[PDB]
Amino acid sequence: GSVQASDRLMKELRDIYRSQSYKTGIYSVELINDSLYDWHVKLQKVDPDSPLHSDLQILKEKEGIEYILLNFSFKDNFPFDPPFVRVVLPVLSGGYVLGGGALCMELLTKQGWSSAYSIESVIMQINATLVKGKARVQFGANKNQYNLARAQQSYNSIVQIH
């Protein structure tokens, strides 16, 4: 990585760990492999009135899982380039989620990303936008259709037409 990226990523984590949204358990953050550049982020409280909330209760009954697990991956040039954010599980339809689990949200593109955004704000926006876009769980869905490679391929396809 880089000193600039790492400095910023540590500041983001620190801000998250002191934030109210984190304190009240809306979402969780953990590093993967102790890498500042790779994070588990679980969306744990989605709009309780949404069908997504209802679907996650069914999933909890089925699989013990009542959350959406996201993966955030950062590059050397962060915060000038956005994090790459993708869904790990469960498989979703709608909600601005693409094949492979990429997210098609303007804040995450080169057009919409600003270093003015905290990572806390990014996590909360994603939560709101899944609900706004009517995300639903795909219950019959092939496990392992989501991974970095396939998410990158979808995101690359969008840049060609966006």
UniProtKB/Swiss-Prot annotation:
Compartment(s) where it occurs, according to its Swiss-Prot or TrEMBL record: Cytoplasm
Tissue specificity as recorded in UniProt: Detected in hypopharyngeal head and neck squamous cell carcinoma, in tumor masses and invasive epithelium.
Modifications after synthesis and translation: Auto-ubiquitinated in vitro.
Active site, UniProt feature: C104
Domain UBC core per the UniProt entry, residue ranges: 4-162
Described function: Accepts ubiquitin from the E1 complex and catalyzes its covalent attachment to other proteins. In vitro catalyzes 'Lys-48'-linked polyubiquitination.
Family, similarity comment: Belongs to the ubiquitin-conjugating enzyme family.
Name of the protein described by the UniProt record: Ubiquitin-conjugating enzyme E2 Q2
Originating organism: Homo sapiens (Human)
Taxonomic lineage: Eukaryota, Metazoa, Chordata, Craniata, Vertebrata
